[PDB]
Amino acid sequence: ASYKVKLVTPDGTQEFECPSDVYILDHAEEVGIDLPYSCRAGSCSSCAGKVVGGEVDQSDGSFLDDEQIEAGFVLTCVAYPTSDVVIETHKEEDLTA
Amino acid sequence: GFTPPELDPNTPSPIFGGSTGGLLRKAQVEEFYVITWESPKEQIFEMPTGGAAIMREGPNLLKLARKEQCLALGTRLRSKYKIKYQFYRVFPSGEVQYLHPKDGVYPEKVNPGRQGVGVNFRSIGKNVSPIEVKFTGKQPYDL
Amino acid sequence: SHSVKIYDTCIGCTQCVRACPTDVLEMIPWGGCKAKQIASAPRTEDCVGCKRCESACPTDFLSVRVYLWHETTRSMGLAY
Amino acid sequence: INLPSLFVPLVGLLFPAVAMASLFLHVEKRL
Amino acid sequence: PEVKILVDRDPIKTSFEQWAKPGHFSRTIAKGPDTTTWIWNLHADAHDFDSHTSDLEEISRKVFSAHFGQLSIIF
Amino acid sequence: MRDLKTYLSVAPVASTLWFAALAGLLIEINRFFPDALTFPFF
Amino acid sequence: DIAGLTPCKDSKQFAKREKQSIKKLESSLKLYAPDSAPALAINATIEKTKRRFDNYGKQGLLCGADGLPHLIVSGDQRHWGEFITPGILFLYIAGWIGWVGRSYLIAIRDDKKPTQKEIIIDVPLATGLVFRGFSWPIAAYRELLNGELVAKDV
Amino acid sequence: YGDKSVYFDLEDLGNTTGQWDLYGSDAPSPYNSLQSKFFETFAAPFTKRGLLLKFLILGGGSTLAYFSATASGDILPIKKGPQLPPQLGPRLG
Amino acid sequence: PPIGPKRGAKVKILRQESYWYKGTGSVVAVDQDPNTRYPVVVRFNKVNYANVSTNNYALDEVEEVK
């Protein structure tokens, strides 16, 4: 259901409440820890992060390498937090390489 | 404001065996392009026109007949390898013209020294009907 | 020379810029969005009319439009 | 003296030659 | 260097799980379809094993057993 | 079993079974009342 | 009669066709054993052909100069069996099909993953729905009168 | 240009763009002067563009006109004409 | 005082160059920022031809419906 989500960030690391049926980035905005975004539709690198523990559903994914899914990277805008996962923010370029 | 690098002839070029995809008469009479990169080591890379060549450890300067071919080779060099490149356009005059990256930073990265060219401050659904620009030389989009 | 226009619905994703084969587009500062960025077309004399940029635009409708126009030898992508 | 014997070659052979030479000359160089 | 029979035991368990799921091999297909184009893609890339994965071993195992299926059809 | 029931209801198999049943029905109907150009009962 | 055609039972070309048809099959029956499988099969189809011609004659079809039973669709009541009663039957069956399909589409439109129930049929729901087609005409009439058959808002 | 590995130099673009002539001779006239003096004296009046074109077109035109307006029957059966009585059509003729 | 329709609303689209024109969608977020010409963000239940299901709109292009 509403598992706690941890996000490392240059601002620090905060915890927010959000139901497994919603994207981590969408409820983050409801609380108010600012994150980057652009398209909001899963087709760009702007909202990129990677994970420390757990894993998010890859069903809400597109315009990604046939590897970015299992090598760590993910999109905050298009992702369902199936567990009490710990993710990274501001992770576009070390993804952009 | 980012004095562009000047082309340095005597810079070697990759080890190639020759191809029928190289330059033609257009390079003789109108223009051709030249790309340069710096090659941490001597390696094999696919030529944007033919087969495979070997980039030398040290300066590499390659002459192509199309700007699009240059950008293709540049993209391949930039993300498959990690190599910074620049290319120029040469005329039959002996003029060279630094082309890319124009202001030192790649265009996918916003730079505070660039002006807006061809930007319309409205949504695409608010162009006038063609009847409104009939018999005047303007195009409804150029407005 | 084809004519490329950028409209204010641009979200400044920059996917189109990363798509163009001939380095026609660019990213420039702006204030109308959350990226403070918008696409410019300062070098349309090199545009081949490929319209890859339009297939990369995630807006609806598009924010980058390519109107094919008078042809040059640069526009026709001719190596001879 | 047979009028076709003259006009069918001239209009079928000469005239297209002259017209096409002239039109190529006109279309294929700069003013 | 020398040549021998070299096998792997039970790499994939026979099951009806993936029959219920249309286009299990393609990540995008597996999730489900938004338009009519998804149905056409499901068939167009059914036997393109070298794009469902990148492992040569898996490609070749699939190829071997598909050949067996074809021989059965011929018989 | 549950998954076999699911797969047997996927669109191609559902439609082939439906159309085979329909074909059987029409075939038998025309096997009993053959060469029918009209409705002669009422 | 209607359109200058004549009752096949009293036509001559219609009979001539029947006799000619029957004639060729009889030839196929010959050159084999009199009571063989193939011969028995040929006999069967001969009797079938005779039954078809007599059935055509009995039903009162109209025959032209070629002896072929023409069909009248103008609405003449002597000929409703040719087009109009089969037409009503077809309209009933097709409305059945379409109404059941529409009923199903409406019923599955409310899930989160409605496409899942379109590439993989919910057969229990479908079997619950199939038999409403039986009353589809009344249901559709009352839906039109209600104003809920056609989507407003579009 | 061509200093071991380099092949690009702004000073000599033609060498860089391969503006060579791979087969030109750069040799003297192989024809003996006497022979040269015979030709360029007799073939001179045909080396003016407009003159040669106009004369060619009109001369060849009247050539064809004369040779076809005055061709004999054994050259073209079209001018020999028919030599047989004609048949009748399916009903007309 | 916030701007535009509230989050989660049901708004009808009025931009005639949009795929979902005269259709309906659900509001996701309307930035309180001025200086943005298209603050409203709307999610739809159907992809467009580019396989995209969310889009930004201006306050006048949306119209809250029932």
Ligand code: CLA
């Ligand atoms: C559009 C009308 C027309 C058409 C289709 C033809 C067609 C034909 N004519 Mg003819 N002709 C015409 C008008 C026409 N004529 C007129 C008005 C005259 C003067 C009375 C003649 C006098 C004439 C003669 C003496 C002969 C023919 C002959 C022929 C046949 C051979 C082709 C040829 O030599 O060209 C025609 C030759 C000409 C000298 C025609 C010149 C006169 C016309 C007006 C020239 C028009 C040119 C104009 C600038 C272009 C018009 C644009 C358009 C047609 C494309 C051919 C079937 C030959 C024949 O009998 O074949 C067996 C033949 O010897 N014609």
Ligand code: CLA
């Ligand atoms: C449309 C007008 C036209 C006319 C009037 C002719 C006329 C003729 N054609 Mg012909 N031809 C035409 C169109 C025409 N052609 C087209 C469109 C095609 C393409 C399919 C051909 C393909 C064709 C073939 C393959 C051949 C002919 C041949 C011939 C000649 C056969 C008759 C003969 O034996 O006489 C006399 C025979 C001669 C050789 C007399 C020579 C003709 C004169 C003397 C040449 C002098 C012309 C002058 C110097 C200038 C040249 C043209 C100038 C006005 C621009 C004849 C003079 C046959 C031929 O003879 O080969 C040349 C033959 O092999 N034609």
Ligand code: CLA
């Ligand atoms: C193209 C012109 C034309 C048209 C439109 C018609 C039309 C018709 N002709 Mg006519 N005819 C024509 C030309 C035409 N004719 C010509 C040129 C001739 C001279 C050769 C004739 C000679 C002729 C004769 C001699 C007769 C007709 C008759 C008829 C009627 C028969 C059908 C009927 O009775 O109603 C309909 C029949 C029903 C049983 C009604 C049931 C249909 C249901 C209600 C609709 C089904 C819909 C669905 C299943 C349920 C509803 C769903 C909904 C609520 C959502 C019909 C209205 C016959 C007549 O007079 O009618 C009594 C007849 O005797 N015609």
Ligand code: CLA
């Ligand atoms: C064996 C004979 C035969 C065969 C094989 C067909 C086959 C076909 N017919 Mg057809 N038809 C026939 C006889 C036949 N017909 C006869 C005798 C009549 C005279 C009544 C008609 C009148 C008829 C009509 C008016 C139509 C067809 C249509 C069709 C096609 C689609 C049917 C369908 O969509 O299913 C299921 C039905 C649906 C998915 C949608 C429902 C549409 C049907 C007609 C129900 C309509 C109900 C409504 C209340 C009545 C409207 C009245 C009408 C005048 C507008 C199909 C290929 C349809 C077509 O051609 O498509 C362009 C079409 O509209 N037929």
Ligand code: CLA
């Ligand atoms: C729920 C099923 C359904 C219904 C009720 C309708 C109804 C209608 N259709 Mg449509 N259609 C359907 C399915 C359906 N269609 C499918 C699957 C296709 C893809 C081939 C089409 C393609 C189609 C076209 C191209 C057109 C229509 C048109 C129309 C309208 C005129 C009638 C007609 O000509 O139909 C024609 C019928 C067909 C072309 C084929 C029908 C396919 C089968 C018979 C229906 C499928 C039933 C479903 C699979 C059963 C599931 C039930 C559940 C228990 C499993 C009418 C409102 C016409 C229109 O626009 O009207 C102005 C028109 O041009 N339809």
Ligand code: SF4
């Ligand atoms: S048409 Fe092609 S070259 Fe021109 S801007 Fe678009 S993608 Fe770039």
